[model samples]
Structure formats: structure tokens, C-alpha cells
Target: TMRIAYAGLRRKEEFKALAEKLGFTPLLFPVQATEKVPVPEYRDQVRELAQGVDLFLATTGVGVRDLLEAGKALGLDLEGPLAKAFRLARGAKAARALKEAGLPPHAVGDGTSKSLLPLLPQGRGVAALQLYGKPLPLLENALAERGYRVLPLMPYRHLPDPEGILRLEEAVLRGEVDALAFVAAIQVEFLFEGAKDPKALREALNTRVKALAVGRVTADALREWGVKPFYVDETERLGSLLQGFKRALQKEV
Candidate 1:
């Protein structure tokens, strides 16, 4: 059986079960872990955003929840404020979060920063942005170019798991892992960023190790870093990814 290693922190058991059912050995090597911002810092940002922002941008579901939670802690009525503003979501997750908070987004993108560009309302007003993991220069720059001031709130950040990264990279280099399953774009970033010999790693993946991407966004990230994915799932679901991999492997046989 082929050994498929997944580089994500969430939904481990489900990934393992699905991979095993597909006759593959599942391995978990989370390259990043979520880190929440200090309460006081985030609360201050939330308080400021609630007062007056023309638009709101939600980049991640957790970030949206965290921002709301912070507002609740401060006795702020964020839902009313958010409903009054034009809200934009980066993907379904963010959209769902906004919907749950009684502030559905005016527009939702396809899980990519660039995808959200066309949805923007001319940009001259202040945009209250909720970020998860890292800053998005593409969205920020677009907003700036459109004339909107960005009030950024980083509710959570991602810290690299060094040991997991080292283990995954070394194992891939040794040809022990058959394929890499990436659920998020940042996983691709951190894995390649921490490689001791990026050229060798790229060569190994391009040859022996297959790369499975969940969607176009992650696949684009792989391509940007000079590594092409072996298979990409349009459904952007783990089950679909495994199902696609099974079919791809069968074709090789």
C-alpha cells in the first residue's frame, strides 16, 4: 500500500479513515498550528472596527468567530454594526461564519484572495478585515488601489510546527512517502519554505512523490512554487481528493 502523508492540523481521524478505505497508509504531519492573538490587543481592534467601517472582509471562518467573540466580550453589538456594513467573504467558510452571526456577506469569493477582487465595492471607505494565519498582500493592495482604507484584525495566526515539517520533508526526500496531500495553500508554503534543499525536494515531488491538492487555490500555490500537483480536486473536499487519487493510481496501473 502507498503511504500518503497529509499536512494539515484539522480533521485527522476523518482523513485517516478515508485514506485507509482507499487502501493507502495515512500519515499526519501538520506543518502549522493556530495561534490566537492576545485578548486585549484583538478586543481593541474589534472595538474600533465596530464603531465605523464601510465594508467588512472575512478571510477565514475562525477569524470571524474570534472577532465576534472578542466583540461580545467587550459588550459590543457587533452583529448590528456588521449588518450595517457591506460584508465580503473569501470563501464558503467565511460566508457561513457571517451567516451564523446574522450578517451574511454581500459577496463571497472562491477561496482565493484574487477571486475576491471583482466583488469589491469601489474601495474609498474603510474596510474592517478579519484575518487568519497570515496577511494577504493581494487583497490589501487591491483595496488600497481602489481607494479603501483597511482596518486589519488578525484574530489568529499560524506558527510552523518545526518537528513536523522536518519529519515530512526528510521522509519525502528518502522516498518513504508515496504522496503528499495538501488541504491548504499555506501548508505548501511552510513545507517548501522549511526545506533544506528545495531543489531536491521539488525534484523528488515532481518525480516519485505525488502531490494531491484540494482545490484550485492550493494547486495554484503549488504551481507558484515550481511544483506541479499530480491531482487536484475541484470539490475541495478531502473525500473527493482521496477518491480522485484512487482513480489516478488505478490509471497508472
Candidate 2:
């Protein structure tokens, strides 16, 4: 059985279960919990910047929960004013949070930046963003063109999972792993960051390792970092990505 290294936070069980169903053995690599900015500080920053703003855009569910938690920590009722003031636009997990929070779910565009514009409120307002992985300037530029001020609130930050990275590096050195799967750009960033030497990391990734990216954003990051992913699915979904991997495996066979 080919061993595949998979890295992510949530949906680990789902991936493992899916891999089992698909007759592949998955080697799980746990990404460290993302560090969240202090709730009070984050809330204060948002409240200050978002004062008199018309709409708030939350891209991820964690962002929505963190912002709501920050609001609660700062003595703001989530169900009361905050929820009423902000309009959430999200896909997959983020969209689920809106429904769970009892807020009316807006629509998800094509699960990409282009689809988000229609849901954006017209007229001048502030759009508070909760960014976790990488900074999305395209979304900001799009919102700016619509005459809305975008205030990005980075509630959670991604740092390299040192132990996981080391393990992956060792596995690569020993040729124990066949492919490395990345669900987000941050995972790819962290992997290279933890390598002992840049040259060795590049050699490992380019020669022995098959790199799989979950979406175009991550594939773009890999390319920018000088590492080309073996597979990049146009659909930014794990199922699609994994299916892409399966196809790669078949080609190899």
C-alpha cells in the first residue's frame, strides 16, 4: 500500500474515512492549532474600524466564530446587534456557521472570489474580514472597486508545525512517503519553512515527492515558492483533490 501524508486541522477523520473507503492508506499529520489574536484586542480593533460600517464579510467559519466570540468577550451580544449589522458570505464550513448562529445565510458565490461580488452590499460601508491562511488582496481589490472599505481582521495566524514538518522531512529523506497532500497554502509554507536546508527540501519535493494541492490558491502558492504541485484541482474541495490524487496514482501505476 502506498503511504500518503495528509495535513490539515478539521476534516481529518473525514479524509481518513474517505481514504479507507477508497482503498488507500493515509498517514495523518496533525497541523498545530492556529494561534488566535486576543479576543478583547481583536474585538476592539474591529469595533473601532467597523464603526458605522454597513456590512461585514466573513470568509471562513473559524473567522465567524472567532469574531462572534470576540464580540461576546467584549460584552457584545452576537444575536443582538452584531449579527444584525454584519452580513456573512461564505461557502462550505463558513456557510454552516451562519446557519448555526441563527443568522440568515446569504448566498455563496462560485466558491471563489468572483462569486462573492453579487452578495456584497451596494453603497459605502466597511467590510470586516477574518483572514487566517494568507492575505487575499484580490478580494480586497474587488471590494474596493465597489466603493466599500475593507477592514481585514486576522483573528488566527498560521505558524509552522515544527514537529510535523520535521516528521515529513525525515520521511522524505528516508523515502517512506510517496506523496504529500496540502489542504491549504499555509501547510505548504510551513513544510518548507521547517526543512533543515532549502536545497534538500526542494530536491525532495521535486524528485521523490508528489505534491498535491487542494485548490488553485494553494497551487499558486506552491508555484510562487518554486515548487510545482503534481496535482491541482480547479474545484477547491478536498474530495476533488483526493480524486485528483487517485487519478495520479493510476497514471503512476
Candidate 3:
């Protein structure tokens, strides 16, 4: 059986159905799940961003959309304030979200924190940063080093399931799965973080177990962990990723 392990919490059934239809055994061992922060804490960040900031760094589209929803609940107008600031987005999704909110990004990066850094100009003051699942120390530290007073706004945080991560790592190392498929960037991070021996895990992924990333963002995360996925689906769709990886597997066989 061609066993494929999925790294998402919610879409387990969907992944299983699709993988079964594609003639593979789907393994659902989610490593992380999205958890919302305290409402008051989130509200304060929304208020701060609404008040005014020198720059707005958007890392994910969902965070941008969630900020707008929370702002709506707080009865605060964020579009005008967002328009007033120099908005820098990490990818097209974030930029599209900004545009949907009637505020377009001043600049857009190539969907990575490292790529986003170069787009940052010299003038820096207060920056309202929208973080994704976890704390982005690289971006945050870079912002601080660049003279920007960073105010992080995390709409949701990724809560890691240590047991699940350990099991997934063990499964890969033991050759229990043919390929490990990732749907999000944070899943890749938590997997490596939970690994007892990250170097060994990375080596196993590079040699024994094949890796499949759902899109460029997840692929970039895998690359950061030193595992070049066998298939990188730039389409950003699970269906395409499944089909693409299947084709890739066929070619290799």
C-alpha cells in the first residue's frame, strides 16, 4: 500500500476520501491546530492597528481577514487606517485580502519572511505585524534591527500536539508511510520541533520517506527544515497536490 500521512487537523476525512480514491492509504496524524487568542488581547491589537502605525506587515491572508472580522466586532474601522500605513504583504493571498478590504498593499513579497525583508524600505517607525500560526522571531527580530517598533498581532496561534508529532516522526523514521504530505507551513515547523533527533528525521525524509508540500509556502517551510519535497504543488490546492504527487510517484516507480 502507498501510505501517505497528512499534516492537517480538520481535513482528515477529505484527505482520506481523496487519497483512497487515488489508490493510497491516507494517514491522518495532525501535528498542529489553530487556536484563537483571548478576545481582549486580540481587541487591543486591533485597536492599536486602527489608531495608526507606520507600517503594516501582513504574513497571511487569514490573519488579515480575521483582523477585519475582529475589527468589525470592535466597531473599529481598519480600512482607512490600513490605507494610511505602508502595507507590505508576504504573498498574493495577503495582498488580495487587503484589496478585498478596500486597502491594497504598497508592496508584496514572494510568500516568505526572507523574501519580505528586502521589500522593507529604510523609513521605519511603528509596525503593526500580522503573524500567522506562530511567533515569527526572524521577521520580528529583523524588524527590531531595522529600527521599527514592532507590535505583533496574532489572530491565531498553532497549538502543537506533541503526541501526534512524535507519532508522525516515528512513522516516517520507521518507514510506515510512503510519503508525508503537509497542508500548512506550521505543521512542518512543529514536526521538526517535536523530533527527538531533528537531523535524523530530516535525513530520513530526504532519503527514505518522500515529502509532499501543498503549496509554495509549505514547500518553503520544508526547504527551511532541509527537506526538499519530492513534489511542490504551486497551485495551492489539495486536489492538485494529490494528483501532482501521484503523478510524481508514478514517474519515480
Candidate 4:
């Protein structure tokens, strides 16, 4: 069995336990997750767009959930406003997150930047883009290029998960891990930031280590940082990632 590094937080004990069931050695060494600090005008934008938005684009599921959470904290009814737009969840997690918030997606994308752009409805007006962490100019440009008014909703910033980052560096430098698995785009940014040297880290990730990306956004994140993912699972599921890795491993044999 090969050792793998999980790069996201645990929602339950199932992640580690599931890896064991799948015949892989898993390390719970996910880089820390940052709080989704609300942007100053985030609520107003959401409220303004609530009146009329052609497509409610959810690039990351957590962004929508967190945005709603903060809206409620500030005594706002975000549910009706967001529900007004035609929703698009970029991946399963975003879809699931939306479902959890009592708002199911009207449509869903294939979970990658390339596949996602076209998913923005062929017919559109103003679209609300709900993204977790940082802003994505690529997404905004693509939407605008395709002739849609892009509304922004950034609920948080992803900070460095400093506590476990150096440990990840040590693992990569020493060749202690066989693979790196990522569940979110932010994990990629945090990992790169945590590295002592970006070039060294990229080298280790490119040659010495195998990588698995859970979603298209995560793959885009990897590419933006100058690292190519060895396997990008379109299913956006942990099980899908493991299955992809297993296929890659089998090919090696």
C-alpha cells in the first residue's frame, strides 16, 4: 500500500477510515483551513443581486453556505434573494453544500475551469458568482466574455494552515509520502504558501510525488501555481480520487 497525504479538513472520522477500507495508508496531515472572513460589501452585493440574477454561479459550495451564515448573523434573509437566480454548482461538493443549505443547484458543471466556463448558461444576463476564498479573475473574465454581467460574492479568505504545513514540507523533502490528494483549490494555495521555497516544492511535487486533485477547481489551482496534477478526478469525490490513483498505480505495474 502507498502512503497518501490528504490536503483538506475532516468533516467526520470517515475520511481516514474509508482510506483504510480502500487499502491505502492515509495521513490526516491536512494543511489547516482558514476562516471565511466576510468581505465588506459581500452582503450588499448579494442583496442587490437577489432582486435579479440570471444565473447564481457557485464556484465553491462553502462560499454560499458561509455567505448565508454571515447574512443570517447580520439579520438578513439571503435565502429568497439567492433562490431567485438560476444556480450552478461547479462540482459535487459545491452542489452538496448548496443542498445542505436548503438550496439545490439548478444546474451543475463538470468540476474544472475549462469545462465550467461553458456551463455558464448559453442564455444569461447578470450572474452571481459565489466563490470561496479569493477572487477568480479567470472566471469573471470568462463570464463577461460570454456576455453576462458578473456579480461577486466572496465570503472568505483562505489563510495558511501554518501548524501542519512545515510537516508536509518535511514529508515531501524526505520522500516520506507517495502521493498528495487535494479536495479544494484553497489547499493548493495554502500548501504553496507554506512551503519554504516554491521552486523546491514544485520540483518535489512534479517529479518525486504523485498528486490527485478532487475537482476541476483544485486542478486549476494546481496549474495556476505551476504544478500539474498527475490525476484529476472529475467526480469530485474522495472515492473518485482514490479510484483514479488506483488506476494510475495499476498502470505503473
Candidate 5:
């Protein structure tokens, strides 16, 4: 039985049961993936910010729904402008969420700046970034430098679990875990960032432990951390992620 480490407790029954069915044992770990919060103060600011925007960058599905509900809560007129604006989604989930919110994404990127770079040019006027968390330096610089007034919205923040990450780091180094299933990019961020000795731990994860990423977002996240994971599901769903890991296990033997 192979020991699999998955961050977060999402789809607990399916995650465990899928591994069992695939002839593997699962060892789950806890990691704080996101802290969902709607800032009441952003109401006035977000409303004013939304007025002068030509492009709407939606990063996540959660951000879409959260922004919608939160915007409504604050009596902010977001839907009208968003409904009529040119929007870009980072992935299918974000695109779907936008459709659900009475808006459709004009384009969908692979949740990365590189893919979205072609869609945006310098001095494109005001652009609203539906930031999933605190401003990402890379993204902020990319947009800001292009002469676009970047209005970043805060729906929630990514929280790292250092203690939990340390445990995973040790487990990987000791060869106690065979695979690490990352559901979010931040989980990868937590593990690599919290490790005391990243080089050694990274080697362990790269060569010794197999890395399983949920989809492109997490895969890109893993790559950003200087590691290419063993498996990334074509589909980002949890069930697909489990099967992706199962297939990797089969491929090895």
C-alpha cells in the first residue's frame, strides 16, 4: 500500500475510498488552504474602482461567487458593469462561475500570467483584478507596469500551515510518504516555504516522493516552486485527481 499525503480535507470519503479501490493506502494531512473573508470596507472602494475598468480578471471560481455575494451585501453595483465588461477567467471553474453570475468570460487562460499576457497590453485603462488573496507581487508588477490602473479586490487570503508543513517535510525526507497530493497552489507554497532546508526536502519530493497536483493551477504552482510534479489531472476535479495518482502508481509498477 502506498502512503499518499493530500492537503485539505475535501471530499474525504471519495479521496480515501478512491485510493483504496486503486490498491493504495492514503495518509491525509491538514493544511489551511484558504481563509474566506469578505471585507466590508471594500464596498465603497470596490464600487468606485469598478467604475473605470475595461478588463475584468477573474482568478478563481470561489472569487467569482464570493465577489458576487459580497458585492450584493455591500450594496455595490458590480453585476451591471461586470455583466457588460470584457472578462477573462483563469480556468474553467472561473469561467463557469462568471457565466453563473450573468457574465461570460471573453477568454480563459491557464490560470497563469503567461497565458493571459497576450490578451492584455500596456496602457489598457483601468482593469479589475479579482485577486484570490493578498496582491501577488508577480501579478501586480506585470499589470501595473503595463500602465493599467490595477484595482485588486480581496475576497480571501491563502494561509500557510507551517506546523503541518513541517510534518510533511519530515515525512517526505524520511521516505514515509510516497506521494503528496496538492489541491491548491498555496499548499505547495506552504510546504516549500515552511521547510527549514528546502533544497534537501525538494530533492526528496522530486526524486523520492511522487508529487500529484490537482490540475494546471497546482501544477503551475509546483513549477513555480521549482518542481515538476509526477502527475497532474487533465481535469481539476477531485475524482480526476485521485485517478491521476492511481494511474501514476500503476505506471511505476
Candidate 6:
């Protein structure tokens, strides 16, 4: 069985289940500490932003739920603009969260930013976004050129894990791990950033390791750093990406 080091929290189970089915041993590496953001305060910020916008864009389902839960925590009515604006975003998890909160499911755009454009209102106001991370310029520039003001509200930020540097160095030096799975670009950046010797890290990564990027965006980031990933899926879905990993494993066999 290939020993694979898995990082990131969002799809840990999905990776583990798939790895088991493929007969590989998955070494779970908890990348970031999961800290609960103050939901009430975050929701209050989202509500204020919602007042000035027509539609709401959510980059991740987790962000959507966090916003909704924050609203409830603040003792705010979950049925009004918060619910409506969230439903407009079309995230499945968002819809489930609204249903759990006793609110009607509003429409959500497809998860991608491009699919989200058609769902925006034609004339009234503009769209507001509550994102988990930094804003993507592609969406911002497109919305601006179309005469829509994009109000971006950041709810949470990622703090670097204290053990991140040490863990990465050990993983490379031991060389027991066959592949490095990155769910986010920041994880990749941090791994390289924290390396004591950049040349050694790069060389280790280039020679004995297979890089598995969860999506194209992460793959592009790796490539930008002159590290071509051995496996990357076009779809951002972890399940589909793991299926790609299975194929790669077969080729190795």
C-alpha cells in the first residue's frame, strides 16, 4: 500500500474513504487548526453588507453556513434578507442550513463565479459577497465592468499552524510519504515558505514525491512555483479528484 500524506480538513473523509477503497494507506496530516469564528458578529457584518446589495455570492458552503449560524446566534430573524440573499447563491449546503433554520430555501447560483453571474438581478443595486478568503479579481473585475458594485465582506482569516513548518520538513526528510495532497494553494505556499532550506525542499518535492492538487487553481499555483504536479483534476470536487488519484495509483502498479 502506498503511504499518502493527506492535508486539509474540508474533504478528509472523502479522501480517506477513497484511499481505503483503492487499497492505499492514508497518513492524515491535519494542516490547519479549525477555529470557530464568532458567528453572531460575522452575521451582523453580513447583514449590514446585505442591506446595500441585490445578490449575495458565497465562495464556499462552509462560509454560507457560518454566516447563517452567525445570524441566528445574534438573535436576528433568519427569514429576511439574510435568508433570501443566501438562498439566491444556490449552495446545496446553504440550502440545507436554511432548511434546518426553519427558513425557506432561496435560489442559489451554481457554485462557480461564472455560473453565478446570470443569477444576479438586472437593474436593482449590486451584489455583496461574504468570502472565506481573499477576493478573486476575475469576479471583481467582471462585476465592475458590468456596472455593478461588488461589496466584499471577509468573515474569517486563516492563521498559520505552529507545527506546519516542522511537519512539512519531516515529511520531506523521511521520504516515507509517496505523495503530497494540497486542497488549497495557501497550504502549498506555507509548506514552501516555512522550509528551512528552500533548495532542499524544492529538490525533495521534485524528485521523490508525487504532488496531487485538488483542483486546477491549486495546480496552477504549483506550476507557477516551477513545480509541476503529477496529478491534478479539473473538477474541484474531492471525490472526483480522488478517483483521478486511483487511476494514477493503477498506473504506478
TM-scores of all candidate predictions against the true structure: 0.63, 0.64, 0.60, 0.62, 0.59, 0.62
Question: Candidate 2 vs candidate 3: which has greater TM-score?
Answer: 2
| Local accuracy of candidate 5 as per-residue lDDT tens digits, 198-253 | 89977887899988887578889888878878999855567777776776677878
Best by TM-score: 2
Model 2 stretches with alpha carbons more than 4 Å out: 33-48, 57-126, 129-152, 251-253
What is the TM-score (0 to 1) of candidate 4?
0.62
Q: Which 10-residue window in model 1 sums to the lowest lDDT?
A: 33-42
Report the candidate with higher lDDT, 4 versus 6.
4
Question: Comparing 2 and 6 by lDDT, which wins?
Answer: 2
If the candidates were sorted by their TM-score against the true structure, best first, what order would they fall in? 2, 1, 4, 6, 3, 5
Residue runs of model 3 more than 4 Å from their true location after superposition: 33-48, 51-154
Model 5 poorest 10 in a row by lDDT: 32-41
Clashing pairs in 5: none
Error of 4 at 56 (Å): 7.4
The C-alpha lDDT values of all candidates are 0.85, 0.71, 0.85, 0.77, 0.76, 0.67
For candidate 3, which ten residues in a row score worst on lDDT? 33-42
Error of 2 at 99 (Å): 16
Cα RMSD, model 5: 8.8
Arrange candidates by lDDT, highest first: which order? 1, 3, 4, 5, 2, 6
The lDDT, on a scale of 0 to 1, for candidate 5 is: 0.76
Clashing residue pairs in all predictions, respectively, total 2, 0, 0, 2, 0, 7
**Which stretches of model 4 miss by more than 4 angstroms?**
40-51, 54-154
Better of 3 and 5 by TM-score: 3
